[PDB]
């Protein structure tokens, strides 16, 4: 079978980003030894090791949706993957408010329309507790 | 001396996808999307592998792929020059759609949930619309990507200024203004697969403005919706019959039940009733063999049954159905069937749109709202001109804000719910737990089930 | 690749004109050509010249000897007793080929002096200075000099260059081919009160030392041919376009407000033609000249167009705005693709005519709507299938005879019949629409942009034709550019519709198989008629069934007859649901007339007109009525109207009446439904129940609610109920009773429409509506019951016709005091008097029409009166009227009138070859042979018209009525 590839964006500190960029544009396999990525079983924490120097990482959710688009002639572009996550290196904490491009900053707060009426999972847990019970008493309340 | 052809009563109103996309192959075009997969629609999380090299916990080296990129590009140029030197079609396999080769650009979206969105494997074009200056003009400012076209009639809602080039994504699904920005100096692109990590740099990232929809998303329980569900199931059944190696072609029912698990089996039987029959005993037992008089349709007929853009419109409809369902009339107006119907009707000239409203995906004055207003002490030129000028103003504000490289500084009853629970502890006990829910969101979802279960008797 | 047929290459030409004398009708001038010999030993140089008296010729300021002979002056000898037309056609083709600049030939043969042979062998420049004089031109320059006294600017006298194709040899010596491109320098010394308009841009205007004359200097740096060079000298009122500022409009004096209103649309035509093609307008200026006694209604030269003043209308004139608008549009289309990109041979003319007509049709589509585009395309296709089934066929791109089925030679444009030239341009633009159907419209516009871009990179070089021949298109270059932009070649389509000269005829009939639910079509072709050919390609058919509209492609090979296509359900008759149409909409249909067993509502063979075809489909009458009512295609509604005349059932009357009542139907379908309803009403007399047809509908739509017989006061601001209102009594007058006489209920209705007409309140004129009222009065005239050939006097007049005669007398006399826009009521009243004379009502006397056909009248009155005289001399076998018409062909001042008299005498001939007539002398054969041979030697359009008249009257063999 075929499994859709999973692309994400890696953001590094600027000096380490310059060393990683120089090693990528060089093209040797020396970069392979220099750059490693260890993702912790939390799922939202990691180490990126640049030149064997550990950096602390967080996998965050991006507010917009990006899409990688490949081309052969630079006139027709084929969508290859959807990017929604970034492993910035240096829950509410795992949500990034800004977008990658310069015009998109504070997009989640300002350029996103918010419509409102985790919570569903809590309601399911409450229903399960009511089922495991015997007698349930309920009242919409006031200030108390 | 005028038109005099009643054209609105007689006539009321190129993209080649990859061979995995036009054949609707199941990684790229899913048969069924559950609720947690509809909430993560076009935002796929980073899954943990169970088997593979990355499934073992520990540090993992990323691998540079620049010999791979230039080897694949040199190989594709050899293929193109061996085939006569013209333009070729290369995306014939799923392994052609990897990010490991070719010139990748990134495309960011301004809206959170667009009315239409491309699946993986589908093609789009970049068109550079350039309105010439009055009289003499030097020529279109040249651009790295796309082809240039001179537009006297603006494709979008606003109109282009003289001497203004605007790039845009153009395909069958939408048409949307894009703006080229340079990448940040810190961000790279990591392509992870089961075997390892791979790293590319990126240099070009476009920002995609508000989409102008060219395909109408169907509504829920619509006739077009049910027709697409039936045709998609039929195409999947035909492609399972084509994949069968048995000389009387035969399939199993629980393959289709694995693909479409929300379907009642009465509908799947209905699709298999014509073109197949069930063998209970003897050879081919518990199989749905193909009828001997039935000619299985060819590949081009199966491609003519369902289009990939219809699948994208259906996925937009069911994702919006989930988001509306989770959030308990303003929201219903912002649903893509309403907004796509409004925009396509405005493009034929049926009706006008209030460009400031609640269907505005920004939530501020930037961007349009595609909801229908009637085209009616002026009742004619005043309304039309007012709508037109508001359209040019919004188009021009969005272009400026999006192309800005300026840095932006980081910035009813009032009643809670209380529940008493009675349980029995180990040995013998009867403790009672009183729990108070102060979250009005938890409240609404909780109560709605009881009121439903109270009527469910 | 273009290789010249001439042994020299012409680089630059100076045309200087002095002494334009309007009293004596004379010009003097010189011409200086700058040729580079391409072959050594050039010796003779052969140039083209007609009617010019060549005074002296100097080559490199050395006196040279010339000899002039024109074989096309007298084509056959006077003392040859041949009288067949094939002899004259071969001799005329040989004579035109002997003066052809497209071969090496020419009429003026200049001998290079001996001392320049060492200058010509090593190939160096030669400057030939001819000076000439036109003494009193019979062609080329037309002098319109009115007989009011005063100065020549005070009386309105002007000159313009007339003619078609290569007719610039008629006023200066040149290389009069479309392939000899050169740069130009044009000087004209005219009177001080006059302006000289020509090609190029006006670099200066200097006075003469007496300040009584001034010289206009024009320069043309874009290399054009000699055939695209024009001239208009007159006392023109100049108007700069207030929108585009390089465009100047010139009109005759006192016609400036008409020019302001008329030429106010042209900037939108410029914007369209520069927005579908991506090239700007190639010339640096544009000049529109409006003149009197024009050759054609619109002529297009390089950077200049010459229209007639009869196109000029005011703001209150409707029914003339679209015609003038489309004349301006096709002049601009020919500016792009007849004058900038020129022709490489006489073959490859179909390319230029097709591109001009095709982009003009795209303009008509955007401007007047897709429905007007479809109606225009259908009327052009019906025109060509009528002409090609009538006589042989039109052959685009012949190979050099290739077409021997027709009485003239197609090797040169000046031997073609004028009807063949018109059908040539018509077929060329329809074949270009077919090429757009195979290769999509955006690729087609990319082809045209590639041709224009090659021409405009070519147009700026100075190399003498190393690169100036990229401005000349050919067929092979056009097909190669098509294959470059698309990757498909159209060589089967080119081989079928260009190289082969025929249209196809389809006879279709269907049968529905209820058992297998299929539709068995039966399409057979008539390929043994003289104009036809056999089609073997694919064929689209559109079937409207209850489940919707489905298209099917049929492969019609030679041995094919029965095509079984599948049919869908009939479950939209089980439930009442709406039936979906060809577009996205759906309607409620009354399915009571439909068959119970068949789902299919109508069938259309080749709906998109993708072949050059004539379809004869055999549907049932209810299918034609459903196709008339619920179709969303105007050509299918028109063909259902045309096919409902054979079914006079009352359901068809209900169908046409529902079409007539229906706004949001295209107006030209309702105008056809009027005449179809009149024919059906005439066929079901002694069955018709109530009032006459369309009368109650006219009183419901256009009359007052309180008074049914009083018409509403005229408000013509809707432009669709105006056309329907002015066409409905014209069809209503074709009603006839059981006695074959028009009823006195419809004639009284038309007379009350005439009496109660009030036009003091609309912003538009009433001349076309009143002219159509006279046409409706003329339609009601039935033949009178003369007893014993009783002389038609005033007392034994019909009581019906006395009212009609009083009305047309009142209208014609009121036109003599308050004239209409183009004397439309004079034309309608002369036509009605000829209608009354054709029946036995008014005495058959041509003296009235002979007085209206004099020179000083308006040209529409003249051609209406001459049409009446041609009809009289056909019916009364008049010898002296035929001699009057032939004399008027020989010496009339306006050449358009001479061409029109020959045209009308060809269309309505006094006798055919089958008839024994008293007018079949040897004297008439000798007169018409002298008119073909000599006499018409100065026009190239009168000579082809005389050939057409001799063919119509005496045929291709020897005139029979002869010793």
Instruction: Annotate C606-637 with three-state secondary structure.
Output: CCCCCCCEEEEEECCHHHHHHHHHHCCCHHHH
CA dihedral C910, C915, C917, C923 (to 10 degrees): 80
Tokens representing B206 are: 């476009």
How far is it, in rounded angstroms, from Cα A86 to Cα B183?
A: 14
Burial class (CB in 10 A: 0-12, 13-18, 19+), C929: buried
Q: Check if B56 contacts A (Cβ < 8 Å).
A: no
User: B120 vs A79: CB contact, 8 Å cut-off?
Assistant: yes
Tokens representing C37 are: 């010999």
Give the residue among C188, C197, C232, C235 at the shortest CA–CA distance from C19. Answer: C188
How far is it, in rounded angstroms, from Cα C711 to Cα C698?
A: 9
For an interface test with B, which of C280, C371, C452 has the most B Cβ atoms less than 10 Å from its Cβ? Answer: C371
Of C271, C368, C584, the CB nearest to B5: C368
Query: For C19-24, which contacts have Cβ atoms below 8 Å and span 24 or more sequence positions?
Result: C19/C189, C20/C159, C20/C188, C20/C189, C20/C190, C20/C191, C20/C233, C22/C143, C22/C145, C22/C152, C22/C157, C22/C159, C23/C145, C23/C152, C24/C136
Give the residue among C140, C165, C160 at the shortest CA–CA distance from C227. Answer: C165
Q: Check if B63 contacts A (Cβ < 8 Å).
A: yes
Q: Check if B89 contacts C (Cβ < 8 Å).
A: no
DSSP C361-411: HHHHHHHHHHHHHHHHHHHHHHHHHHHHHHSS---SS-------SSSS-SS
Give the residue among C346, C339, C342, C338 at the shortest CA–CA distance from C429. Answer: C338
Instruction: Give the three-state DSSP class for C431.
Output: helix
How far is it, in rounded angstroms, from Cα C301 to Cα C220?
A: 13
Tokens representing C738 are: 């059981």
User: B3 vs C369: CB contact, 8 Å cut-off?
Assistant: yes
Q: Check if B84 contacts C (Cβ < 8 Å).
A: no
- CB count, 10 Å around CB of B275? 19
Give the residue among B343, B90, B121, B337 at the shortest CA–CA distance from B211. Answer: B343
Alpha helices in C787-858 (DSSP H): 799-817, 824-838, 847-852
The answer to whether C176 and C158 are in contact (CB under 8 A) is no
Q: Which residues of A touch B118 (CB under 8 A)?
A: 67, 79
Scan residues 328-387 of B and list those with Cβ closer than 8 Å to C: none
Quick one: DSSP state of residue A57? Answer: E
For an interface test with A, which of B22, B59, B210 has the most A Cβ atoms less than 10 Å from its Cβ? Answer: B59
How far is it, in rounded angstroms, from Cα C117 to Cα C101?
A: 24
User: B402 vs A73: CB contact, 8 Å cut-off?
Assistant: no
CA-to-CA separations, C808 to C711, C776, C830, C833, in angstroms, rounded: 20, 12, 9, 8
Tokens representing C617 are: 């489909």
Residue B31 region, left (φ>0) first, then alpha (ψ -120 to 50), else beta? alpha
Give the residue among C628, B441, C296, B315 at the shortest CA–CA distance from A82. Answer: B315
The answer to whether B434 and B419 are in contact (CB under 8 A) is yes
Give the residue among C654, C724, C362, C583 at the shortest CA–CA distance from B9. Answer: C583
How far is it, in rounded angstroms, from Cα C559 to Cα C844?
A: 58
Tokens representing A103 are: 């015009």
Bridge pairing between strands B105-109 and B204-208: parallel
Of B1, B5, B12, the CB nearest to C369: B5
Tokens representing A73 are: 């002639």
Scan residues 647-666 of C and list those with Cβ closer than 8 Å to B: 663-666
How far is it, in rounded angstroms, from Cα C364 to Cα C330?
A: 10
How far is it, in rounded angstroms, from Cα C837 to Cα C848?
A: 12
Give the residue among B266, B292, B264 at the shortest CA–CA distance from B277. Answer: B292
Please give the radius of gyration of chain A, using alpha carbons only, rounded to the nearest integer.
Answer: 22
Give the residue among C895, C868, C894, C890 at the shortest CA–CA distance from C881. Answer: C868
Q: Which chains touch C (3 or more CB pairs under 8 A)?
A: B
- CB count, 10 Å around CB of C289? 29
Instruction: Give the three-state DSSP class for C82.
Output: coil
How far is it, in rounded angstroms, from Cα C822 to Cα C814?
A: 14
How far is it, in rounded angstroms, from Cα C684 to Cα C692?
A: 11
Please give the radius of gyration of chain C, using alpha carbons only, rounded to the nearest integer.
Answer: 31
Q: Which residues of B touch C663 (CB under 8 A)?
A: 6
Scan residues 352-371 of B and list those with Cβ closer than 8 Å to A: 360-364, 366
How far is it, in rounded angstroms, from Cα C928 to Cα C934?
A: 10
User: C368 vs B6: CB contact, 8 Å cut-off?
Assistant: no
Bridge pairing between strands C504-513 and C613-618: parallel
For an interface test with C, which of B10, B86, B130 has the most C Cβ atoms less than 10 Å from its Cβ? Answer: B10
Alpha helices in C99-147 (DSSP H): 117-120
Give the residue among B389, B18, C735, C940 at the shortest CA–CA distance from A78. Answer: B18
CA distance B185 to chain A (A): 7
Give the residue among C333, C242, C236 at the shortest CA–CA distance from C290. Answer: C236
Burial class (CB in 10 A: 0-12, 13-18, 19+), B83: exposed
Sequence-separated (6 or more) residues with CB below 8 Å from residue C175: C6, C10, C33, C47, C48, C101, C106, C226
Report the DSSP beta bridge partners of residue B212. B175
User: B13 vs C634: CB contact, 8 Å cut-off?
Assistant: no
The answer to whether C189 and C204 are in contact (CB under 8 A) is no
Q: Check if C370 contacts B (Cβ < 8 Å).
A: yes
CA C738 to chain centre: 41
Q: Check if C368 contacts B (Cβ < 8 Å).
A: yes
Give the residue among C700, C742, C747 at the shortest CA–CA distance from C721. Answer: C700
CA distance A15 to chain B (A): 9
Phi and psi angles of residue C270, each rounded to the nearest 5 degrees, phi first = -60, -45
Please give the radius of gyration of chain B, using alpha carbons only, rounded to the nearest integer.
Answer: 27
User: C371 vs B9: CB contact, 8 Å cut-off?
Assistant: no
Quick one: DSSP state of residue C928? Answer: H
Instruction: Give the three-state DSSP class for C506.
Output: strand
3-state secondary structure chain B: CCCCCCHHHHCCCCCCCCHHHHCCCCCCCCCCCCHHHHHCCCCCCCCCCCCCCCCCCCCEEEEECCHHHHHHHHHHHHHHHHCCCCCCCCCCCHHHHCCCCCCCEEEEECCCCCCCCCCCCCEEEEEEEECCCCCCCCCCCCCCCCEEECCCCCCCCCCCCCCCEEEEEECCCEEEEEEEEECCCCEEEEEECCCCEEEEECCEEEEECCCEECCCCCCCCCHHHHHHHHHHHHHHHHHHHHCCCCCCCEECHHHHHHHCCCCCHHHHHHHHHCCEEEECCCCCCCEEEECCCCCCCCHHHHHHHCCHHHHHHHHHHHHHHHHHHHCCCHHHHCCHHHHHHHHHHHHHCCCEECCCCCCCCCCCCCCCCCCEECCCCCCCHHHHHHHHHHHHHHHHHHHHHHHCCCCCCCCCCCCCEEEEEECCCCCCCCCEEEEEECCHHHHHHHHHHHHHHHHCC
How far is it, in rounded angstroms, from Cα B251 to Cα B245?
A: 10
Alpha helices in C209-320 (DSSP H): 256-262, 266-276
Quick one: DSSP state of residue C228? Answer: G
Does chain B touch chain C (at least 3 C-beta pairs within 8 Å)? yes
CA distance B246 to chain A (A): 21
Please report the sign of the dihedral spanned by the C-alpha atoms of residue C49, residue C54, residue C58, residue C64.
positive
Sequence-separated (6 or more) residues with CB below 8 Å from residue C336: C273, C277, C279, C281, C282, C356, C359, C452
Query: Angle, nearest 10°, between helix axes C859-875 and C824-838?
Result: 10
The answer to whether C518 and C507 are in contact (CB under 8 A) is no
Please report the sign of the dihedral spanned by the C-alpha atoms of residue C466, residue C470, residue C471, residue C473.
positive
Please report the sign of the dihedral spanned by the C-alpha atoms of residue A121, residue A123, residue A126, residue A131.
negative
The answer to whether B17 and C672 are in contact (CB under 8 A) is no
User: B118 vs A79: CB contact, 8 Å cut-off?
Assistant: yes
Query: For chain C, first and last CA: distance in Å?
Result: 54
Q: Which residue of B has its CA nearest to C318?
A: B1
Q: Which residues of A touch B38 (CB under 8 A)?
A: none
How far is it, in rounded angstroms, from Cα C850 to Cα C760?
A: 35
Sequence-separated (6 or more) residues with CB below 8 Å from residue C499: C395, C396, C397, C399
The answer to whether C164 and C295 are in contact (CB under 8 A) is yes
Q: Which residues of C touch B150 (CB under 8 A)?
A: 275, 278
Give the residue among B331, B336, B335 at the shortest CA–CA distance from B358. Answer: B331
The answer to whether C198 and C232 are in contact (CB under 8 A) is yes
CA atoms within 13 A on the CB side of A110: 14
CA distance C675 to chain B (A): 20
Instruction: Give the three-state DSSP class for C601.
Output: strand
Q: Which residues of A touch B23 (CB under 8 A)?
A: none
Give the residue among B309, B347, B287 at the shortest CA–CA distance from B232. Answer: B309
Q: Check if C245 contacts B (Cβ < 8 Å).
A: no
Q: Which residues of A touch B435 (CB under 8 A)?
A: 126
Of B45, B402, B415, the CB nearest to A141: B415
The answer to whether C552 and C538 are in contact (CB under 8 A) is no
Instruction: Give the three-state DSSP class for C468.
Output: helix
Q: Which residues of B touch C632 (CB under 8 A)?
A: 9-11
The answer to whether C163 and C295 are in contact (CB under 8 A) is yes
User: C370 vs B10: CB contact, 8 Å cut-off?
Assistant: yes
Bridge pairing between strands B417-422 and B432-437: antiparallel
Q: Check if B229 contacts A (Cβ < 8 Å).
A: no
The answer to whether C157 and C233 are in contact (CB under 8 A) is no
Q: Which chains touch B (3 or more CB pairs under 8 A)?
A: A, C
Give the DSSP H/E element, type plus range, for residue C334.
helix C321-334
Give the residue among C7, C38, C42 at the shortest CA–CA distance from C118. Answer: C42
Give the DSSP H/E element, type plus range, for residue C539.
strand C538-545
Report the DSSP beta bridge partners of residue B301. none
Give the residue among C110, C75, C80 at the shortest CA–CA distance from C95. Answer: C75
CA-to-CA separations, C832 to A136, C309, C326, C827, C903, in angstroms, rounded: 102, 27, 30, 9, 21
Quick one: DSSP state of residue C782? Answer: P
Structure method: cryo-EM
How far is it, in rounded angstroms, from Cα C590 to Cα C580?
A: 14
CA distance B255 to chain A (A): 15
Give the DSSP H/E element, type plus range, for residue C580.
strand C579-580
CA-to-CA separations, C147 to B164, C22, C258, in angstroms, rounded: 59, 12, 24
How far is it, in rounded angstroms, from Cα C81 to Cα C962?
A: 11
The answer to whether C339 and C302 are in contact (CB under 8 A) is yes
The answer to whether C871 and C849 are in contact (CB under 8 A) is no
How far is it, in rounded angstroms, from Cα B342 to Cα B368?
A: 12
- CB count, 10 Å around CB of B216? 19
User: A113 vs B330: CB contact, 8 Å cut-off?
Assistant: no
3-state secondary structure A64-127: EEEEEEEECCCCEEEEEEEEEEEEEECCCCCECCCCCCCCCCCHHHHHCCCCCCCHHHHHHHHH
User: C666 vs B152: CB contact, 8 Å cut-off?
Assistant: no
For an interface test with B, which of C369, C485, C632 has the most B Cβ atoms less than 10 Å from its Cβ? Answer: C369
Report the DSSP beta bridge partners of residue C551. C542
Give the residue among C320, C273, C264, C325 at the shortest CA–CA distance from C298. Answer: C325
How far is it, in rounded angstroms, from Cα C495 to Cα A121?
A: 73
CA atoms within 13 A on the CB side of B240: 25
CA distance B45 to chain C (A): 41
Tokens representing C326 are: 């489309």
Tokens representing C688 are: 């018709």
Q: Which chains touch A (3 or more CB pairs under 8 A)?
A: B
User: For chain A, how many residues are written?
Assistant: 144
Phi and psi angles of residue C803, each rounded to the nearest 5 degrees, phi first = -70, -40
- CB count, 10 Å around CB of A95? 11
Query: For C567-570, which contacts have Cβ atoms below 8 Å and span 24 or more sequence positions?
Result: C567/C512, C567/C517, C567/C518, C567/C519, C567/C543, C567/C598, C567/C599, C567/C600, C568/C599, C569/C599, C570/C545, C570/C546, C570/C599
Q: After which residues is chain A broken (C to N over 2.5 A)?
A: 90, 117
How far is it, in rounded angstroms, from Cα B312 to Cα B318?
A: 10
How far is it, in rounded angstroms, from Cα B404 to Cα C316?
A: 53
User: C271 vs B152: CB contact, 8 Å cut-off?
Assistant: yes
Tokens representing C951 are: 């063919």
């Amino acid at each position: 079978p075929h499994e859709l590839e999973s692309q994400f964006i890696l953001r590094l500190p600027p000096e380490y980003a310059s060393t990683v960029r120089r090693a990528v544009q060089s093209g040797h396999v020396n970069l392979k030894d220099r750059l490693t990525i260890e993702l912790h079983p939390d799922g939202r924490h990691g180490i990126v090791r640049v030149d064997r120097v550990p950096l602390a990482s967080k996998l965050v959710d991006l507010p917009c949706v990006m899409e990688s688009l490949k081309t052969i002639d630079k006139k027709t572009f084929y969508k290859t993957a959807d990017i929604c996550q970034m492993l910035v290196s240096t829950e509410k904490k795992f949500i990034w408010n800004h977008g990658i491009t310069l015009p998109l900053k504070n997009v989640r707060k300002r350029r996103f329309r918010k419509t409102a009426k985790d919570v569903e999972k809590e309601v399911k847990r409450l229903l399960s507790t009511d089922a495991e019970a015997v007698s349930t008493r309920w009242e919409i309340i006031a200030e108390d | 001396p005028w038109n005099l052809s009643n054209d609105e009563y007689y006539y009321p109103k190129i993209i080649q996808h990859s061979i995995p996309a036009v054949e609707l192959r199941q990684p790229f075009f899913p048969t069924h999307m559950g609720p947690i997969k509809l909430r993560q629609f076009h935002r796929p999380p980073l899954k943990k592998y169970s088997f593979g090299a990355l499934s073992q916990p520990g540090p993992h080296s990323v691998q540079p792929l620049l010999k791979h990129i230039k080897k694949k590009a040199k190989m594709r140029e050899q293929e193109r020059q061996a085939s006569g030197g013209g333009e070729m079609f290369f995306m014939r396999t799923p392994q052609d759609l990897t990010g490991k080769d070719g010139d990748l650009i990134l495309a960011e979206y301004s809206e959170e949930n667009g009315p239409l969105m491309m699946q993986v494997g589908m093609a789009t074009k970049i068109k550079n619309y350039y309105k010439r200056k009055p009289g003499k003009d030097p020529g279109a400012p040249d651009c790295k990507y796309g082809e240039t076209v001179y537009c006297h009639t603006s494709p979008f809602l606003g109109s282009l200024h003289p001497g203004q080039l605007l790039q845009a994504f153009e395909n069958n699904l939408f048409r949307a203004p894009i703006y080229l920005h340079k990448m940040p100096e810190t961000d790279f692109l990591i392509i992870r697969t089961r075997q390892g990590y791979y790293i590319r740099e990126l240099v070009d990232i476009f920002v995609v403005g508000q989409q102008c929809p060219l395909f109408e998303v169907p509504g829920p329980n619509s006739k077009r919706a049910n027709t697409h569900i039936r045709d998609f199931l039929q195409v999947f059944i035909y492609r399972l019959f084509w994949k069968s190696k048995d000389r009387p072609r035969r399939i199993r029912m629980e393959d289709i039940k694995k693909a479409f698990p929300s379907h009642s089996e009465s509908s799947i039987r209905k699709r298999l009733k014509l073109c197949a029959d069930f063998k209970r005993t003897g050879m081919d037992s518990n199989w749905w063999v193909l009828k001997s008089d039935f000619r299985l349709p060819t590949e081009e007929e199966i491609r003519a049954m369902v289009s990939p853009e219809q699948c994208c419109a259906y996925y937009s409809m069911i994702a919006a159905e989930q988001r509306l369902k989770d959030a308990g009339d303003d929201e219903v107006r912002t649903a893509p069937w309403n907004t796509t119907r409004a925009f396509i009707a405005a493009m034929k000239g049926k009706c006008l749109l209030e460009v400031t409203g609640v269907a505005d995906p920004t939530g501020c004055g930037e961007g349009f709202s595609y909801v229908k207003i009637p085209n009616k002490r002026f009742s004619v030129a005043e309304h039309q001109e007012r709508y037109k000028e508001e359209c040019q103003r919004i188009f021009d504000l969005q272009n400026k804000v999006l192309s800005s490289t300026e840095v932006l500084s980081t910035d009813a009853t009032g009643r809670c719910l209380k529940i008493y629970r009675t349980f029995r502890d180990e040995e013998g006990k009867e403790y009672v737990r009183c729990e108070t829910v102060r979250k009005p969101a938890v409240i609404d979802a909780y109560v709605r089930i009881r009121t439903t279960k109270d009527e469910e008797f | 690749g273009f290789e010249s047929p001439r042994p020299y290459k012409l680089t630059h030409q100076v045309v200087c004109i002095n002494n334009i004398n309007f009293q004596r009708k004379s010009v003097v001038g010189f011409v200086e050509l700058t040729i580079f010999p391409t072959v050594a030993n050039l010796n003779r140089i052969k140039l083209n010249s007609k009617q010019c008296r060549i005074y002296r010729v100097r080559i490199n300021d050395l006196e040279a000897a010339f000899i002039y002979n024109d074989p096309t002056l007298e084509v056959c000898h006077s003392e040859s007793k041949q009288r067949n037309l094939n002899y004259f056609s071969n001799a005329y083709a040989a004579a035109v080929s002997a003066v052809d600049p497209d071969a090496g030939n020419g009429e003026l043969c200049i001998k290079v002096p001996s001392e320049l042979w060492k200058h010509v062998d090593e190939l160096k420049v030669l400057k030939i200075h001819i000076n000439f004089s036109l003494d009193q031109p019979k062609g080329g320059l037309h002098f319109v000099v009115p007989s009011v006294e005063g100065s020549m600017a005070e009386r309105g006298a002007h000159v313009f260059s007339c003619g078609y194709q290569n007719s610039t040899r008629f006023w200066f010596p040149c290389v009069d081919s479309y392939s000899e491109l050169c740069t130009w320098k044009l000087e004209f010394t005219v009177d001080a009160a006059m302006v000289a308009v020509s090609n190029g841009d006006l670099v200066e205007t200097v006075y003469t030392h007496d300040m009584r004359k001034k010289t206009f200097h024009y320069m043309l740096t874009i290399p054009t041919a000699a055939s695209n060079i024009s001239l208009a000298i007159g006392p023109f009122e100049i108007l700069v376009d207030p929108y585009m500022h390089e465009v100047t409009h010139f009109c005759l004096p006192q016609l400036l407000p008409l020019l302001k209103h008329t030429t106010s649309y042209l900037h939108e035509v410029f914007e369209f033609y520069e927005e579908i093609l991506t090239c700007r307008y190639p010339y640096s200026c544009f000049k529109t000249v409006f003149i009197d006694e024009a050759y054609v209604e619109v002529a297009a030269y390089a950077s200049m167009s010459i229209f007639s003043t009869n196109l000029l209308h005011s703001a209150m004139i409707i029914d003339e705005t679209p015609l003038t608008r489309r004349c301006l549009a096709q002049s601009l289309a020919q500016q792009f693709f007849g004058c900038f990109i020129s022709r490489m041979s006489w073959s490859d003319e179909w390319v230029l005519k097709g591109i001009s007509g095709y982009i003009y049709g795209l303009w008509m589509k955007k401007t007047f709507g897709v429905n007007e585009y479809r109606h225009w395309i259908k009327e052009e296709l019906d025109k060509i299938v009528a002409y090609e089934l009538k006589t042989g066929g039109v052959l685009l791109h012949p190979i050099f005879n290739p077409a021997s089925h027709l009485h003239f030679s197609i090797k040169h444009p000046h031997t073609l019949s004028w009807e063949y030239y018109s059908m040539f341009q018509c077929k060329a633009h329809l074949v270009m629409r077919l090429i757009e159907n195979r290769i999509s419209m955006e690729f087609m516009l990319q082809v045209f942009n590639k041709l224009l871009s090659l021409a405009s990179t070519a147009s700026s070089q100075k190399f003498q034709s190393h690169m100036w021949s990229q401005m000349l298109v050919s067929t092979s270059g056009f097909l190669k550019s098509i294959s470059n932009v698309s990757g498909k070649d159209i060589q089967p389509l080119i081989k079928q519709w260009v190289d082969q000269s025929g249209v196809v005829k389809f006879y279709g009939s269907f049968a529905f198989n209820r058992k297998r639910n299929v539709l068995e079509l039966e399409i057979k072709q008539d390929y043994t008629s003289p104009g036809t050919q056999k089609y073997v390609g694919p064929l689209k058919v559109t079937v409207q069934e209850l489940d919707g509209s489905f298209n099917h492609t049929l492969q019609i090979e030679e041995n094919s007859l029965k095509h079984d296509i599948p049919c869908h359900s009939k479950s939209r008759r089980n439930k009442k649901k709406k039936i979906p149409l060809m577009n996205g909409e759906e309607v409620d249909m009354d399915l009571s007339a439909m068959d119970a067993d068949s789902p299919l509502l109508w069938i259309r063979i080749d709906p998109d007109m993708s072949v050059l075809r004539k379809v004869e489909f055999e549907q049932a009458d209810f299918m034609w009525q459903y196709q008339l009512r619920y179709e969303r295609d105007v050509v299918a509604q028109q063909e259902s109207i045309l096919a409902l005349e054979k079914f006079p059932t009352p359901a068809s009357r209900l169908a046409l009446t529902d079409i007539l009542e229906q706004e949001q139907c295209f107006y030209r379908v309702r105008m056809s439904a009027c005449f179809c309803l009149a024919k059906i009403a005439n066929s079901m007399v002694s069955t018709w129940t109530g009032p006459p047809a369309m009368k109650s509908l006219f009183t419901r739509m256009f009359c007052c609610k309180s008074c049914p017989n009083i018409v509403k006061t005229n408000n013509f601001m809707s432009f669709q109920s105006y056309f329907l209102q002015k066409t409905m009594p014209v069809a209503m007058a074709l009603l006839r009773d059981v006695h074959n006489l028009c009823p006195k209920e419809v004639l009284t209705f038309i007379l009350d429409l005439i009496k109660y007409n009030d036009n003091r309140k609309n912003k538009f004129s009433d001349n076309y509506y009143r002219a159509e009222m006279i046409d409706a009065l003329a339609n009601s005239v039935t033949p009178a019951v003369s007893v014993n050939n009783e002389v038609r006097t005033l007392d034994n007049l019909n009581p019906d016709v006395r009212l009609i005669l009083e009305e047309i007398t009142r209208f014609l006399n009121m036109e003599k005091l308050l004239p209409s826009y183009r004397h439309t009521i004079t034309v309608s009243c002369l036509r009605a008097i000829r209608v009354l004379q054709k029946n036995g009502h008014v005495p058959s006397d041509p003296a009235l029409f002979k007085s209206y056909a004099e020179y000083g009248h308006f040209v529409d009155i003249r051609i209406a009166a001459l049409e009446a005289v041609v009809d009289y001399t056909k019916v009364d076998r008049s010898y002296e009227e035929l001699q009057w018409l032939l004399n008027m062909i020989q010496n009339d001042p306006v050449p358009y009138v001479r061409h029109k008299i020959l045209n009308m005498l060809t269309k309505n001939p006094p006798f055919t070859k089958n008839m024994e007539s008293p007018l079949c002398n040897e004297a008439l054969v000798d007169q018409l042979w002298k008119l073909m041979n000599s006499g018409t030697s100065h026009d190239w359009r009168l000579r082809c018209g005389a050939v057409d008249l001799y063919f119509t009257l005496f045929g291709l063999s020897r005139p029979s009525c002869l010793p």
